[PDB]
Amino acid sequence: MNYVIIGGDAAGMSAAMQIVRNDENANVVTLEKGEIYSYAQCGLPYVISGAIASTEKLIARNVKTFRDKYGIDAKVRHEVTKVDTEKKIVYAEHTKTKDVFEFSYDRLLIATGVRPVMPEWEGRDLQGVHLLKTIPDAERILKTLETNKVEDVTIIGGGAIGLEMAETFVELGKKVRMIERNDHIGTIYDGDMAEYIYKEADKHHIEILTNENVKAFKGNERVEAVETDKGTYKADLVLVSVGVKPNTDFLEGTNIRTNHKGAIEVNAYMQTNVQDVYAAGDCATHYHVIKEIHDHIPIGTTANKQGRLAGLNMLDKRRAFKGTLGTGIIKFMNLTLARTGLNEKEAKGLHIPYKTVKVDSTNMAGYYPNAKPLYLKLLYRSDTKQLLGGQVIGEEGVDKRIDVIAMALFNKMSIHDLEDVDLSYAPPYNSVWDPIQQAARRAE
Amino acid sequence: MNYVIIGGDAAGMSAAMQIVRNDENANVVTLEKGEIYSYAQCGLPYVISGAIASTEKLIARNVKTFRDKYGIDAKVRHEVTKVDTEKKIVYAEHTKTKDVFEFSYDRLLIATGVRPVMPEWEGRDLQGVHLLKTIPDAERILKTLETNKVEDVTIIGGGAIGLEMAETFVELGKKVRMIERNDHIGTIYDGDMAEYIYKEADKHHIEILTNENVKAFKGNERVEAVETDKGTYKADLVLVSVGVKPNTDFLEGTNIRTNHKGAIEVNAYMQTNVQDVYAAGDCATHYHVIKEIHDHIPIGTTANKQGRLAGLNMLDKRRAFKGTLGTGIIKFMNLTLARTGLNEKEAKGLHIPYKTVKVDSTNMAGYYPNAKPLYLKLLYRSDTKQLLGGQVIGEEGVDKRIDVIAMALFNKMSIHDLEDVDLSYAPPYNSVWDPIQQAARRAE
Numbered sequence A, B: 001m002n003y004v005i006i007g008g009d010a011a012g013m014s015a016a017m018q019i020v021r022n023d024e025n026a027n028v029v030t031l032e033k034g035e036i037y038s039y040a041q042c043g044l045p046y047v048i049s050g051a052i053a054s055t056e057k058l059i060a061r062n063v064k065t066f067r068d069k070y071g072i073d074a075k076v077r078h079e080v081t082k083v084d085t086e087k088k089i090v091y092a093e094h095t096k097t098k099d100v101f102e103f104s105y106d107r108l109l110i111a112t113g114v115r116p117v118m119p120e121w122e123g124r125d126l127q128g129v130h131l132l133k134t135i136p137d138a139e140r141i142l143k144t145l146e147t148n149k150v151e152d153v154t155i156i157g158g159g160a161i162g163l164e165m166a167e168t169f170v171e172l173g174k175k176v177r178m179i180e181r182n183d184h185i186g187t188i189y190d191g192d193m194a195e196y197i198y199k200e201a202d203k204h205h206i207e208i209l210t211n212e213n214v215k216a217f218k219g220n221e222r223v224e225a226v227e228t229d230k231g232t233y234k235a236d237l238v239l240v241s242v243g244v245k246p247n248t249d250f251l252e253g254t255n256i257r258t259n260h261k262g263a264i265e266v267n268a269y270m271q272t273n274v275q276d277v278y279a280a281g282d283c284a285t286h287y288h289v290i291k292e293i294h295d296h297i298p299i300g301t302t303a304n305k306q307g308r309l310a311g312l313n314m315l316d317k318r319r320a321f322k323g324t325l326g327t328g329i330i331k332f333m334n335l336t337l338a339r340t341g342l343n344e345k346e347a348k349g350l351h352i353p354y355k356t357v358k359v360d361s362t363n364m365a366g367y368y369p370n371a372k373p374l375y376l377k378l379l380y381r382s383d384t385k386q387l388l389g390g391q392v393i394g395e396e397g398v399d400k401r402i403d404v405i406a407m408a409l410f411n412k413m414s415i416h417d418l419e420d421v422d423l424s425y426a427p428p429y430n431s432v433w434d435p436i437q438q439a440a441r442r443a444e
């Protein structure tokens, strides 16, 4: 009857909705540190670029809707500072008044996500130095752009967010530099596929600095330069996007098990090792279909799936989480960048014997107008030929190909079985053999 | 050592290539009625519309390449009139001289495709009345357009070719009418999905006449009108696209088994019931993954797959054809029309107990600019919830969704398992739950 959920976004409220729909008697309390529930963090770079009208558009469901329509006791400005798992009590501090409130639970869900990491650099706190995670973060970036005169923007780190924001700043007419860490080389894309990204950045005059370490941010009250071990470069706005940390700090003192980075370990049913305590989303570990290990790939698709499953399992409607594939997709300038399953760094790390096939092809029939190049790479087990992963890069039809690859991986297909699938074809959409199938044929 | 292939296009030459690559000794003779090998019939409507420069662009590999590079004895203007399966002799007529040649075989492949059907209507042979199958057919259509004043075009029959050519004729600035057949209502799309097609045609001023029967084409030397049981309408060019017949006539008296429509029955290995005689592509039957029966769905993807498999199996490199899903995709004006697996008429026809889910959705996040409506319908088994088929209609992301559905059908997935797949998402490509997954969730 008493369900408590910590975190009022994707994982937390996906759970809440399951509970509310499948238990009419349920008393659901949700505890959110901020003032905004159920919003799309994914849309933030597109609000900042002006492509979306306002952050208001990103809100999927109101706290007022959660309260009035669904009868969920949704709290705002409630930061949980500790949980007593023996007494089954959650302790929340109001972020403004600092008053402490107790919430007893029969079942608890931790859905606190991750936070972006700001390393302890001199200049950390300078005006115009930004992280991007929340709606307030986006507004503050917009406020820097609106007041302060911004010509040069430096992005620290890459990955999805760094790349998307490099585009956003280019589209806002800025001169964009990216400074890239060595610790993230090959983590998403293999070297040969990443070449297409460097080429596209160069093409749009996004300066990318490799093997260069941030030393400090310089300026008065506002930032005006980035200092590295190799130089000092003008910057009127710095976005730091170098890594994330699970928001699980507050659970020190409980016996709740955590991986090395602090992500909460969950079994098939979203349960921690502590009785009646569940976790879901970016704050939790993610069973990997191919790795067969509990990984951490904090993404919004997985968070909704895990959150929905946490709610269901909290209701004893037993259903197992099938896993992540490490699927990810990025819009970067004119390119679409997609990956799923294992890349070479991942395969090597697991000591899985693998081979690769790469094809430079097109998204559709070469004779059809506006046919575009399509770069597609697959990994497969050298013994069983089990498909292990794929990377697709091009202007069009990249999402289609990665979803097909994802489906293949989910079903544990052999690479050559792809040849046998009746995939769709007409000249404006594909070639008579899909690029995936052409690559499959090249495999041993 | 002696391999003979009848038909010099997709199925026949996919086979020849397999044989040539996997047997160095092989003497391959290919017998082709026309003068053009290995061309994309699929691109024909796009040459006629002007989108593709010329028919030459559709040729994937020519007879000179087959002869000089691959050592295939590729014959043109050779029409096979007779096969003696006991003596293992193929009899061919030269189409010009009418001289008779004979070809001895160890293994034979029939890859003769289908032909468009011209019903026995008065006016059949009037100038401006056209079938569309071959490059010469397209040139003849272009010739009618170049030398005559065409303003009104009438198309007999819907289907993929009918709809594509309706587009082509609208794009050429013509007033287009199409007169649809009642026998083919619900064969591709369910009634509720077909509504979207009728709406889009109406929007572009394509007159569609329902339950109306053609009785004659009228005119002096050329067509000037089409007469039906309900009226007589002006037409300067008539395209008849009402069905196809397997080119298997010539095999009468061989004991080669054939279905009711004349398509050659093949087993898993592309073998007919007659020793050392194979068949593949449009002239052959197509084992259906979902129907679990030998169907006939003649398209170019299946033709290449079957032709490739026939060559391999002719070399005793034993490999089973996994089947068709009945996948099909059409560009129609602003819409993309995709279907795969079973529709309602097919499910009912088989007495497979089924339910449906239909979702009016978008191709991506609703808040993202240029997000477009997406209409998606799924069929699934009442008892096991096994996915049975899908129909998707919309402006963008239709091909992606049908290929995902195709993959699911190939793997015999239950509808709710789709909820678990780590499909890709970023705002420019999808919603955080794919439309297929949202439909899956509505299912019982």
Ligand SMILES: Cc1cc2nc3c(=O)[nH]c(=O)nc-3n(C[C@H](O)[C@H](O)[C@H](O)COP(=O)(O)OP(=O)(O)OC[C@H]3O[C@@H](n4cnc5c(N)ncnc54)[C@H](O)[C@@H]3O)c2cc1C
Residues within 6 Å of the ligand: A006, A007, A008, A009, A010, A011, A012, A031, A032, A033, A034, A040, A041, A042, A043, A044, A045, A078, A079, A080, A081, A111, A112, A113, A114, A132, A133, A134, A160, A161, A247, A250, A280, A281, A282, A283, A298, A299, A300, A301, A302, A303, A329, B425, B426, B427
């Ligand atoms: C710029 C950006 C772009 C992205 N793009 C994509 C994309 O294209 N595709 C994709 O799949 N994913 C994307 N993501 C990731 C996606 O936004 C997240 O994976 C998803 O929001 C995770 O949901 P969650 O509920 O686990 O965590 P969150 O959405 O982070 O929610 C956790 C909530 O818990 C609250 N909280 C934390 N600690 C406490 C506490 N102690 N007490 C009370 N409340 C607390 C926080 O205020 C927060 O609201 C993107 C993320 C960012 C930042």
Ligand SMILES: Cc1cc2nc3c(=O)[nH]c(=O)nc-3n(C[C@H](O)[C@H](O)[C@H](O)COP(=O)(O)OP(=O)(O)OC[C@H]3O[C@@H](n4cnc5c(N)ncnc54)[C@H](O)[C@@H]3O)c2cc1C
Residues within 6 Å of the ligand: A425, A426, A427, B006, B007, B008, B009, B010, B011, B012, B031, B032, B033, B034, B040, B041, B042, B043, B044, B045, B078, B079, B080, B081, B111, B112, B113, B114, B132, B133, B134, B161, B247, B250, B280, B281, B282, B283, B298, B299, B300, B301, B302, B303, B329
């Ligand atoms: C307008 C149009 C659009 C199409 N669009 C698509 C599409 O978008 N997607 C798709 O998948 N498919 C499409 N198709 C279908 C695709 O073109 C065919 O399925 C494919 O060409 C079939 O290959 P095949 O080798 O079995 O037969 P064919 O390609 O028809 O080749 C058979 C050959 O056999 C020869 N032949 C016949 N009889 C004899 C004989 N007695 N002796 C010697 N030779 C003989 C013929 O001359 C012919 O060249 C389209 C077809 C048309 C007409």
Ligand SMILES: *SCCNC(=O)CCNC(=O)[C@H](O)C(C)(C)COP(=O)(O)OP(=O)(O)OC[C@H]1O[C@@H](n2cnc3c(N)ncnc32)[C@H](O)[C@@H]1OP(=O)(O)O
Residues within 6 Å of the ligand: A008, A009, A010, A011, A013, A014, A017, A018, A037, A038, A039, A040, A041, A042, A043, A060, A061, A300, A301, A304, B432, B441, B442, B443
């Ligand atoms: S950066 C991307 C990550 N961020 C976000 O997703 C944004 C924050 N999102 C959330 O917090 C959740 O995604 C919310 C908005 C809470 C989703 O809540 P719900 O789970 O209630 O989602 P829906 O409102 O879409 O409801 C889903 C269930 O309702 C059934 N259903 C929907 N529509 C219909 C119709 N028309 N007819 C019948 N049923 C319908 C669905 O089947 C679904 O049922 P389940 O039982 O939940 O599968």
Ligand SMILES: *SCCNC(=O)CCNC(=O)[C@H](O)C(C)(C)COP(=O)(O)OP(=O)(O)OC[C@H]1O[C@@H](n2cnc3c(N)ncnc32)[C@H](O)[C@@H]1OP(=O)(O)O
Residues within 6 Å of the ligand: A432, A441, A442, A443, B008, B009, B010, B011, B013, B014, B017, B018, B038, B039, B040, B041, B042, B043, B060, B061, B300, B301, B304
């Ligand atoms: S309307 C659409 C239907 N119409 C048509 O398809 C047009 C007519 N088409 C055809 O007749 C055939 O599709 C043709 C053009 C004959 C294709 O013949 P091939 O089967 O020879 O096709 P490829 O030339 O692509 O060769 C395929 C085999 O070669 C291997 N391969 C290609 N490229 C490479 C590279 N770079 N490196 C290694 N191997 C390569 C493929 O793996 C493939 O091998 P298989 O053993 O056949 O799988």
